[PDB]
Every structure is written in C-alpha cells, then in structure tokens.
Amino acid sequence: TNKILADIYGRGWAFPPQFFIGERIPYEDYSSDLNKYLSEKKIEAEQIVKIQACIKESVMCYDFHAKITSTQVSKQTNLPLNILVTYTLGDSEISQKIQGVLRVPPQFSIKDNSRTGIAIAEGTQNVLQSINILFLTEPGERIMREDYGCGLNDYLFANISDELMTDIQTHIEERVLRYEPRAEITSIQVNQRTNLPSTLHVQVTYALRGSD
Amino acid sequence: EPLIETQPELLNWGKHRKVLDYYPVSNKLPACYGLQTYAETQQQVHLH
C-alpha cells in the first residue's frame, strides 16, 4: 500500500537534506557463480529455484525496479554466505552492485549501509514534510518566490489573547490552502503552555486529498 | 593655410564593471536550512 500512496502523492528529497555513501565492494572476492557453486555442492535441485526466489524477493523489497542479471559468492565463505548481486534498473542500461548474506527455508539479508545518494520522502511522509517546510519558511526568504511561506513571525510578541489565537488559526488555514493542495486541514488547536507561560502550542491535524 | 595635425585613433576605455565579484549562492537559501549560522552539526557541514 506504500507503493500506491507514493505513486498518488509523489516522491522527492527528504528534509533536511541527508547524504550517504555505501561501503566499497571487495571485487577481488566474487569470481564464482552461485548456481554452479550450489550445483557443485550437490544441494537439491529444487533448492536452486527456492534460493533464487529468495534473492529476487529480497532485492525487490530493497528496490522494486531491479532486474537480477548475475550473482556470485565470496571466495572466503565456503559454507553464512556472502553474495554480490548485480542488477539493472528497469529497461535501462545502468547496472549496480549490492552485497548480501544468504543463509540455508532460505533467508537472504542485505548489508545495512549499501545505498549511495540522498534520502527520499514518499507519499504521506512527503506531504507531511511539505507542510512542515511551509511553517518554517517566512515570505521573502525564497529567491524569486517571495510570496511562498507561512509568515507566523508577524504574530510574535503579541499579547496572548482570544484575538491572537483566532488570528493564528485562521492564518494557518489560508496559507495551507494556498500552498499545499494535496493536504486538507481538519482541526487546529492553540493552547498556552503551563510550564512556559510565554509560549503557544499549536496542534494541526491534516488529511490526504481523496483519502476517503 | 591652417596647420593640419592628425593624431592616432583610439577606442577609449569604457567603464570597468565589477564582474569578478562573486556572492555565494548558499546565502540565498532560507534560514531553516541551517546554512546561515556557523556549522556545528554533521548535517550542516555535509550540506555545505
């Protein structure tokens, strides 16, 4: 269902930006086909398809655009197996490699720190993060997008009163409607903190577009 | 007869323009990205 929500609402960079670099692959350790290695070790024939099904399923969960092209076994694990998996993304010409651990039902695990790039936000997380960025941005900060932002700084230092709480609540309603069409605000609650009398706590509750 | 005197022809200097001056583009990001204060966390350093 996470795929369904991601396709409907979109995918994008996570906020705040984060960067990762995966661990290096010791290429001088994988020079033996897994299928020949299992066949040589007289493992059962029906185990080959069950083994390969586990590899394909685990990789697809890691990245569902993958298409396995080759597989190899580390020479330093001759029956906890270390596998270097080679795959292509969709119908592209790009190839990538990824380490894994196979255990003989067969179980396959992926190395924890293997992906290189940015962190992404999908579906509900994307729209939730989108509203968060709007709250933290003041108008005039975005270059060539001077209108974008919420602008709650204008209500600071005002006396805490019924007029202020309604002004804050109605301001949020109008700005979210203008700059966030994928979300609908269902309730806003403004309260004054007891331990810190000078601070206001705003509770915002949102629902997705067409979620019902 | 008046005395003719021909001087060398020149294309005089124009106005020098401060093209070399550069302003970093990370200064245009909103303050919520953490690139305005001195970097102390790993996340701020990585973005820089």
Helix (H) or strand (E) run with residue B21 in it: none
Answer whether A18 sits within 8 Å of B33, measured CB to CB.
Answer: no
Chain A interface disruption, residue of B23, B25, B28, B32, most A CBs within 10 A: B32
Provide the token pair at B27. 């200064």
Q: What is the resolution of this structure in A?
A: 2.7
A137: nearest CB among B28, B30, B47: B30
Confirm or reject contact between B36 and chain A (CB < 8 A).
no
Q: Which residues pair with A183 in a beta bridge?
A: A208
Residues A80, A133 contacting (CB under 8 angstroms): no
Residue entry with tokens 């190839």: A95
Nearest to B44 by CA among A16, A144, A203: A16
**B28, B32, B46 member nearest A137 (Cβ):** B32
Which residue of B lies nearest to A148 if distances are taken between CA atoms?
A: B30
Q: How much of chain B is helix, strand and coil, in % rounded to 5?
A: 25, 0, 75
How many alpha carbons fall within 13 Å on the CB side of residue A11? 10
Q: Quick check: B30 contacting A, CB < 8 Å?
A: yes
Comparing CA positions, the residue from A36, A8, A10 lying closest to residue A122 is: A10
CB atoms within 10 A of CB A149: 21
CB-CB under 8 Å, B34 with A136 = no
Which two structure tokens, joined as six digits, stand for A60? 């697809």
CA distance A133 to chain B (A): 8
> A133 and B47 in contact by Cβ < 8 A?
no
Q: Which 3-state string (H, E, C) describes A81-106? A: EEEEEEEEECCCCCEEEEEEEEECCC
Chain A residues whose CB is inside 8 A of the B32 CB are 133, 136-137
- Cα–Cα distance between B10 and B8 in angstroms, integer? 6
Instruction: Let me know if A49 is exposed, middle or buried by CB neighbors in 10 A (0-12, 13-18, 19+).
Output: exposed
Minimal C-alpha gap between A53 and chain B (Å): 39
Method of determination is cryo-EM
Any A CB within 8 A of B32 CB: yes
CA atoms lying within 13 Å on the CB side of residue A75: 7
Phi-psi domain of A86 (left: phi exceeds 0; alpha: psi -120 through 50; beta: other)? beta
Among residues B33, B7, B31, the alpha carbon closest in space to that of A18 is found at B33
Peptide bond into A16 cis (omega under 30): yes
Contact present, A148 and B30 (Cβ < 8 Å): no
SS in 3 state form for chain A?
CHHHHHHHHCEEECCCCCEECCCCCCHHHEEEEHHHHHHHCCCCHHHHHHHHHHHHHHHHHHCCCEEEEEEEEECCCCCCEEEEEEEEECCCCCEEEEEEEEECCCEEEECCCCCCEECEEECHHHHHHHHHHHHHCCCCCCCCCCCCCCCHHHHCCCCCCHHHHHHHHHHHHHHHHHHCCCEEEEEEEEEECCCCCCCEEEEEEEEECCCC
Q: If you count them, how many residues does chain B have?
A: 48
Q: Which helix (H) or strand (E) holds B44?
A: helix B42-47
